[PDB]
Design an enzyme around this catalytic site. Sequence first.
Site, PDB file in Angstrom:
ATOM      1  N   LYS A 141       0.867  -4.359   8.942  1.00 19.26           N
ATOM      2  CA  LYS A 141       1.982  -3.581   8.933  1.00 19.26           C
ATOM      3  C   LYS A 141       3.182  -4.218   9.888  1.00 19.26           C
ATOM      4  O   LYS A 141       2.913  -4.849  10.971  1.00 19.26           O
ATOM      5  CB  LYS A 141       2.035  -1.928  10.102  1.00 19.26           C
ATOM      6  CG  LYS A 141       3.142  -1.300  10.061  1.00 19.26           C
ATOM      7  CD  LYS A 141       3.152   0.010  10.890  1.00 19.26           C
ATOM      8  CE  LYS A 141       4.531   0.749  10.700  1.00 19.26           C
ATOM      9  NZ  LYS A 141       4.780   1.933  11.260  1.00 19.26           N
ATOM     10  N   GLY A 174       8.864   1.031   8.997  1.00 21.23           N
ATOM     11  CA  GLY A 174       8.238  -0.750   8.414  1.00 21.23           C
ATOM     12  C   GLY A 174       6.680  -0.286   7.608  1.00 21.23           C
ATOM     13  O   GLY A 174       5.934   0.431   7.418  1.00 21.23           O
ATOM     14  N   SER A 175       6.369  -1.589   6.478  1.00 15.28           N
ATOM     15  CA  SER A 175       5.441  -1.637   5.670  1.00 15.28           C
ATOM     16  C   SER A 175       3.858  -1.952   5.939  1.00 15.28           C
ATOM     17  O   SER A 175       3.895  -2.367   6.735  1.00 15.28           O
ATOM     18  CB  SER A 175       6.148  -2.187   4.213  1.00 15.28           C
ATOM     19  OG  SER A 175       6.403  -3.214   4.552  1.00 15.28           O
ATOM     20  N   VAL A 176       3.207  -1.147   5.771  1.00 17.87           N
ATOM     21  CA  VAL A 176       2.026  -1.680   5.253  1.00 17.87           C
ATOM     22  C   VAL A 176       1.435  -2.698   4.166  1.00 17.87           C
ATOM     23  O   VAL A 176       1.952  -2.499   2.475  1.00 17.87           O
ATOM     24  CB  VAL A 176       0.544  -0.670   5.593  1.00 17.87           C
ATOM     25  CG1 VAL A 176      -0.516  -0.878   5.826  1.00 17.87           C
ATOM     26  CG2 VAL A 176       1.574  -0.194   6.627  1.00 17.87           C
ATOM     27  N   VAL A 201       0.778  -1.287   0.048  1.00 22.72           N
ATOM     28  CA  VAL A 201       0.345   0.556   0.056  1.00 22.72           C
ATOM     29  C   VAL A 201       0.565   1.245  -0.018  1.00 22.72           C
ATOM     30  O   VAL A 201       1.853   1.628   0.645  1.00 22.72           O
ATOM     31  CB  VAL A 201      -0.927   0.411   1.624  1.00 22.72           C
ATOM     32  CG1 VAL A 201      -1.507  -1.486   0.877  1.00 22.72           C
ATOM     33  CG2 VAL A 201      -0.007   0.090   2.223  1.00 22.72           C
ATOM     34  N   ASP A 243      -0.797   6.407  12.933  1.00 27.39           N
ATOM     35  CA  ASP A 243       0.555   7.157  13.669  1.00 27.39           C
ATOM     36  C   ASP A 243       1.340   6.132  12.547  1.00 27.39           C
ATOM     37  O   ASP A 243       1.865   6.011  12.303  1.00 27.39           O
ATOM     38  CB  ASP A 243       1.020   6.318  15.048  1.00 27.39           C
ATOM     39  CG  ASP A 243       1.216   7.971  15.717  1.00 27.39           C
ATOM     40  OD1 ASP A 243       1.613   8.603  15.381  1.00 27.39           O
ATOM     41  OD2 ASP A 243       1.198   7.755  17.655  1.00 27.39           O
TER      42      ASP A 243
HETATM   43  C1  LIG Z   1       0.999   5.591   8.774  1.00 30.28           C
HETATM   44  C2  LIG Z   1       0.150   4.474   8.783  1.00 30.28           C
HETATM   45  N1  LIG Z   1      -0.970   3.776   8.315  1.00 30.28           N
HETATM   46  N2  LIG Z   1      -0.510   2.710   8.455  1.00 30.28           N
HETATM   47  C3  LIG Z   1      -1.999   2.853   7.687  1.00 30.28           C
HETATM   48  C4  LIG Z   1      -1.708   2.589   5.987  1.00 30.28           C
HETATM   49  C5  LIG Z   1      -3.102   2.324   5.270  1.00 30.28           C
HETATM   50  C6  LIG Z   1      -4.561   2.155   5.729  1.00 30.28           C
HETATM   51  C7  LIG Z   1      -4.409   1.903   7.185  1.00 30.28           C
HETATM   52 CL1  LIG Z   1      -5.703   2.032   7.133  1.00 30.28          CL
HETATM   53  C8  LIG Z   1      -3.322   2.130   8.068  1.00 30.28           C
HETATM   54  C9  LIG Z   1      -0.384   2.510   9.390  1.00 30.28           C
HETATM   55  C10 LIG Z   1       0.183   3.291   9.729  1.00 30.28           C
HETATM   56  N3  LIG Z   1       0.830   3.270  10.897  1.00 30.28           N
HETATM   57  S1  LIG Z   1      -0.434   2.691  12.374  1.00 30.28           S
HETATM   58  O1  LIG Z   1       0.709   2.353  13.591  1.00 30.28           O
HETATM   59  O2  LIG Z   1      -1.210   3.562  12.588  1.00 30.28           O
HETATM   60  C11 LIG Z   1      -0.666   1.421  11.993  1.00 30.28           C
HETATM   61  C12 LIG Z   1      -0.580   0.030  12.363  1.00 30.28           C
HETATM   62  C13 LIG Z   1      -1.490  -0.739  10.797  1.00 30.28           C
HETATM   63  C14 LIG Z   1      -1.466  -1.166  10.604  1.00 30.28           C
HETATM   64  C15 LIG Z   1      -1.133   0.286   9.554  1.00 30.28           C
HETATM   65  C16 LIG Z   1      -0.918   1.534   9.879  1.00 30.28           C
END
Ligand SMILES: Cc1nn(-c2cccc(Cl)c2)c2c1NS(=O)(=O)c1ccccc1-2
EC number: 2.7.11.24
Length: 325
Positions: A45, A28-30, A26, A155
């Site tokens: 993530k 650390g990577s998500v 999409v 975050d």
């Molecule tokens: C910056 C970010 N995007 N991001 C994120 C990126 C795309 C969609 C969604 Cl819902 C969140 C996250 C993050 N970091 S987080 O700690 O809020 C987090 C935890 C678990 C999964 C993703 C994130």
Amino acid sequence: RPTFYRQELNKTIWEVPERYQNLSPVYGSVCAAFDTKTGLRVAVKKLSRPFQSIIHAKRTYRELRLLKHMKHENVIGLLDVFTPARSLEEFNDVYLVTHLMGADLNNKLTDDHVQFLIYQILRGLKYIHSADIIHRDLKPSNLAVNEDCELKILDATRWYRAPEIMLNWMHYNQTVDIWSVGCIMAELLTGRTLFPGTDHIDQLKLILRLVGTPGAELLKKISSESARNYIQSLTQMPKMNFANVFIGANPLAVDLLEKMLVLDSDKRITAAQALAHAYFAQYHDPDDEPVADPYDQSFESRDLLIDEWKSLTYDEVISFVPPPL
Ligand SMILES: Cc1nn(-c2cccc(Cl)c2)c2c1NS(=O)(=O)c1ccccc1-2
């Protein structure tokens, strides 16, 4: 207990349980994915090198504690946390799972829309702030928005920082976040970045230009002499009329910004106070704007070894309780 399967993606590996399917990319990577146990689209993530150093290990620990504590509709909620490892001895990788949302505020809206989006940001800050947590980095990128226009806090970066962060005031408070919200709201009503500084000096120059240079009442509260001279050593400027900067926006919105973009953090409005501002006449419900359980931040002051932060994190993973569907 569950079955894991390895996979390559994002030029990175993933060993996730088998209930998460169809990983797609999409700090650390998500990844986007499908969760079979509930049939929701989730985001997974994978922390990068969570325990490479003491600072990292502590951050990994801090991030898990914060996410485990958040239970509110406008703040990111932890659906699952897991690791492939079978033993603390084997424990070196951490994945976090949350409801997938899609777009960011990053991706010109109407005054009705703006109201709803800022309202939800403040409802989430109210919650976060009741636990003595300061986000510190609210920006459009950190505000996830779904198709229904529902929002969750998750975050340059300097563009939204309170001026007492730019100058490294050691004792700033919660209302740094209110400043960020102020810049965001402004950006949504104008389609323009309020303060697109190029550096920490330009940035401040832009702010002072709108908010005016500090009064003697504020100058007397600044402990650093460097800071003070640097400031006092600048060309005096006055507060502008926000009604002439935000021309033709709702005069209630403008009123709200005047109260958020105050230079002195001691007089900036709070999340709870702003939620009762007139601008949110139609969303505001004090029976449905909750505050959080107390959050133990005692660890923030400890100096532990990597092996210690790593084991507390492991405990937190193991003691995770999913929410109800
Ligand atoms: C910056 C970010 N995007 N991001 C994120 C990126 C795309 C969609 C969604 Cl819902 C969140 C996250 C993050 N970091 S987080 O700690 O809020 C987090 C935890 C678990 C999964 C993703 C994130």
